Amino acid sequence: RIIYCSSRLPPDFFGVLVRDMLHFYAEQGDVQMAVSVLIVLGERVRKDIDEQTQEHWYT
Amino acid sequence: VINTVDTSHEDMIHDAQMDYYGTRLATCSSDRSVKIFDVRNGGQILIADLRGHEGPVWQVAWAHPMYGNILASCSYDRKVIIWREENGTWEKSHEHAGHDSSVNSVCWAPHDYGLILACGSSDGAISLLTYTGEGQWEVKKINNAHTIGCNAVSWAPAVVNYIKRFASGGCDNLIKLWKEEEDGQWKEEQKLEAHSDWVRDVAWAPSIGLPTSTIASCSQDGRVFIWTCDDASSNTWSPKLLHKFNDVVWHVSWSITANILAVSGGDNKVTLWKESVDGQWVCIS
Amino acid sequence: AEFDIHRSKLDPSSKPLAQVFVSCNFCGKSISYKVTSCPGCRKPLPRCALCLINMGTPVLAQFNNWFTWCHNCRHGGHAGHMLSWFRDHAECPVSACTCKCMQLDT
Amino acid sequence: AYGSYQDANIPFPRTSGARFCGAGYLVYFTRPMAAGKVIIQDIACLLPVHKSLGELYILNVNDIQETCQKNAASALLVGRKDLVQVWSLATVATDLCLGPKSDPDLETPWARHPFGRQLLESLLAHYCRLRDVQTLAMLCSVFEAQSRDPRERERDQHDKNKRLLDPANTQQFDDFKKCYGEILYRWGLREKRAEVLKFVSCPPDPHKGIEFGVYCSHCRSEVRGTQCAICKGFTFQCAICHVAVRGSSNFCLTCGHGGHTSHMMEWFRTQEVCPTGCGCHCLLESTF
Ligand SMILES: [Zn+2]
Ligand SMILES: [Zn+2]
Ligand SMILES: [Zn+2]
Ligand SMILES: [Zn+2]
Ligand SMILES: [Zn+2]
Ligand SMILES: [Zn+2]
Ligand SMILES: [Zn+2]
Numbered sequence: 114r115i116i117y118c119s120s121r122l123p124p125d126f127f128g129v130l131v132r133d134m135l136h137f138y139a140e141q142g143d144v145q146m147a148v149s150v151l152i153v154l155g156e157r158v159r160k161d162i163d164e165q166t167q168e169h170w171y172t
Numbered sequence: 173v174i175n176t177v178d179t180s181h182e183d184m185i186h187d188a189q190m191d192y193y194g195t196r197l198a199t200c201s202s203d204r205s206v207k208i209f210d211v212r213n214g215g216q217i218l219i220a221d222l223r224g225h226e227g228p229v230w231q232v233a234w235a236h237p238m239y240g241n242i243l244a245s246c247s248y249d250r251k252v253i254i255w256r257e258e259n260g261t262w263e264k265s266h267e268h269a270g271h272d273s274s275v276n277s278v279c280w281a282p283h284d285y286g287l288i289l290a291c292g293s294s295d296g297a298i299s300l301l302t303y304t305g306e307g308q309w310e311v312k313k314i315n316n317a318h319t320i321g322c323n324a325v326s327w328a329p330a331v332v333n334y335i336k337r338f339a340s341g342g343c344d345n346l347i348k349l350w351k352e353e354e355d356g357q358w359k360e361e362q363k364l365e366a367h368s369d370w371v372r373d374v375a376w377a378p379s380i381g382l383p384t385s386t387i388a389s390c391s392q393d394g395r396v397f398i399w400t401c402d403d404a405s406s407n408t409w410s411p412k413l414l415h416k417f418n419d420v421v422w423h424v425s426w427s428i429t430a431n432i433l434a435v436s437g438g439d440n441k442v443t444l445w446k447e448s449v450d451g452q453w454v455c456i457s
Numbered sequence: 458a459e460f461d462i463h464r465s466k467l468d469p470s471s472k473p474l475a476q477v478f479v480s481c482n483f484c485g486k487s488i489s490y491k492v493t494s495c496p497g498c499r500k501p502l503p504r505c506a507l508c509l510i511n512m513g514t515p516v517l518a519q520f521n522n523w524f525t526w527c528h529n530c531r532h533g534g535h536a537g538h539m540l541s542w543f544r545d546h547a548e549c550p551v552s553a554c555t556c557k558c559m560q561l562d563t
Numbered sequence: 564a565y566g567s568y569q570d571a572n573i574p575f576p577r578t579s580g581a582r583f584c585g586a587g588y589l590v591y592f593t594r595p596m597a598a599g600k601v602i603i604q605d606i607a608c609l610l611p612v613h614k615s616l617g618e619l620y621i622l623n624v625n626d627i628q629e630t631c632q633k634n635a636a637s638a639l640l641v642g643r644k645d646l647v648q649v650w651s652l653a654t655v656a657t658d659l660c661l662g663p664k665s666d667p668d669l670e671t672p673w674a675r676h677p678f679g680r681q682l683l684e685s686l687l688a689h690y691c692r693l694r695d696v697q698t699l700a701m702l703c704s705v706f707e708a709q710s711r712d713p714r715e716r717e718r719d720q721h722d723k724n725k726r727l728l729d730p731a732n733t734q735q736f737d738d739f740k741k742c743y744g745e746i747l748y749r750w751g752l753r754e755k756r757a758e759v760l761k762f763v764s765c766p767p768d769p770h771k772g773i774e775f776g777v778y779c780s781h782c783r784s785e786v787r788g789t790q791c792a793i794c795k796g797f798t799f800q801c802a803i804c805h806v807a808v809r810g811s812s813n814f815c816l817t818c819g820h821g822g823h824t825s826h827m828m829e830w831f832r833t834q835e836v837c838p839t840g841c842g843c844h845c846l847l848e849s850t851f
């Protein structure tokens with residue numbers, strides 16, 4: 114909420130961190146958290162993950 | 173804002189520097205005198221007017237407040253004079269005349285090393301004056317430091333006992349690094365050769381903990397060079413040209429964070445430079 | 458205190474004795490003072506913890522130029538600086554020191 | 564002879580100069596084109612540090628959330644927005660409920676989470692590129708303050724992994740803190756310097772030089788401490804309240820008498836003689 118719902122930081126300063134957080138949560142079998150975050154964020158992070166991984170998590 | 177101060181000297185000003193707190197100012201001129209003012213709340217109060225030199229005065233330098241109120245001046249009379257303030261009045265407290273030619277530059281060491289003064293003269297020898305206590309000094313002379321004569325001296329920021337290093341620039345168009353050995357003797361460490369004319373000033377940028385060493389050099393020919401070392405293991409320096417000015421470049425100074433460079437040259441103009449993100453240096457004024 | 462002053466003025470034989478002496482921790486020699494540096498080892502006086510100024514260097518409110526010393530933490534400094542620091546904090550201002558020198562006495 | 568043929572090695576004298584001085588001042592002079600003037604200009608709008616923020620920041624070891632919230636509020640007041648965002652993130656990321664566990668097998672330490680050590684490293688890298696020593700020192704203080712046989716090797720690795728600050732780079736953080744402390748001291752603020760320096764991992768060395776000892780009030784022996792080693796009693800007693808003194812104290816080097824700081828302050832507020840009757844004007848013999 115702090116990161117997204119807002120002499121400033123670069124506009125996409127946190128993209129890599131969010132992607133790595135999603136991967137970290139999905140790499141230990143906790144698909145629920147990753148899918149929930151993906152649905153909630155929507156287009157703000159959709160383009161940083163390849164379609165195959167998204168389909169794998171959803172299924 | 174702006175504060176304008178009237179020197180009231182009788183001839184041209186050659187250098188001016190404030191104290192460590194930014195509350196007092198010391199100027200030097202060809203009138204063989206040194207004026208010390210107070211500039212609190214934008215005022216001009218002539219605190220002191222000292223005359224002890226028999227010739228023109230080139231540079232002055234304040235010491236760290238940790239050791240009190242100490243000023244050092246180098247003059248054309250082949251003399252360096254130290255002024256100290258006791259009981260609210262300034263007075264000459266020591267004198268050194270170990271050189272045979274005009275002394276051009278003076279600089280205080282970082283306060284961690286103690287109270288050490290480094291002088292550089294045209295005779296080609298560099299004198300280090302170490303404070304021994306009880307109002308007594310020790311003198312160490314590095315003779316034949318440069319081919320013709322030294323012009324600028326700059327200490328290096330202290331890093332973790334300790335290792336003392338500084339840089340010197342003379343009339344040989346070469347920059348020479350100097351490091352203190354464990355015994356106490358000083359040995360030349362490395363040489364840098366990129367200028368084509370007399371080297372007039374060198375300034376070693378302050379440190380904030382980043383693993384990078386930076387030195388700025390300006391010379392007679394108008395070249396300004398930034399020497400960078402990104403690895404203390406290699407001890408290698410890669411010069412870059414900042415800009416080529418049409419006239420002589422006299423003095424270069426760093427900011428406290430070593431991110432802005434101030435250049436004053438023979439064109440009677442002052443410029444400010446900042447490093448771009450792309451690694452280039454661009455003017456500000 | 459006034460009675461003691463009167464007694465001392467009338468009786469000189471009832472003078473009290475000194476309480477604090479000066480001894481170097483390096484030369485190990487007792488020092489009688491004032492004195493600028495160690496007579497033997499030339500080591501200077503301890504510096505103020507907040508102003509980093511050596512003791513004995515100059516600069517009503519003249520009392521502020523005294524040296525407050527804490528025999529527990531063996532630290533000290535200028536009276537005004539130390540009092541101002543302790544007015545809002547409750548620890549020895551020196552790093553890695555935990556003595557509450559002012560709050561200890563009560 | 565000045566300017567003669569013997570001075571071929573002496574460079575031509577300067578007539579203009581510009582130099583940084585103080586913490587936010589530029590001092591320069593130029594050829595008049597009867598001597599010129601000297602110009603002092605304030606350039607605080609160029610450096611990556613602010614004096615007002617230095618005056619407004621606080622660092623309480625006991626409470627972290629309060630410090631983070633107040634720092635965020637002050638940063639908002641000044642006009643920096645990235646600082647507000649960073650301070651809010653630090654507020655969330657340093658809560659007490661994320662405390663590490665002793666047993667490595669219970670849960671993944673929060674330092675391993677990508678919103679922990681990696682985020683901190685990214686912020687540090689960005690501000691190192693910006694050369695903002697103030698923010699670096701503040702962050703390296705706040706996050707550090709939270710720290711407060713194969714089995715042995717695994718436990719040591721777990722201990723080394725549960726810290727948001729990489730132990731391999733303690734020196735860089737200490738250098739950040741020292742540089743910011745020196746800047747604060749140059750600014751004239753002293754208490755903030757001590758507060759910042761209280762977070763340095765490396766302690767300094769004790770003063771090697773003149774020390775003060777006290778004559779025992781009972782055995783009159785030289786005792787280096789608040790308690791005697793022979794009589795086992797208190798060696799220093801106040802000259803006013805006649806109570807044992809254990810904390811801060813003041814004494815006259817000329818007369819050798821002293822006691823409690825507040826007591827002696829009250830006594831010398833109005834009086835000018837040594838309160839023990841020694842006849843020494845301790846004020847004039849002490850205030851050198
Ligand atoms: Zn001694
Ligand atoms: Zn103590
Ligand atoms: Zn202490
Ligand atoms: Zn003090
Ligand atoms: Zn005893
Ligand atoms: Zn006395
Ligand atoms: Zn007395």
Ligand SMILES: [Zn+2]
Pocket residue numbers: 801802803804805806822823824826827
């Ligand atoms: Zn008392």
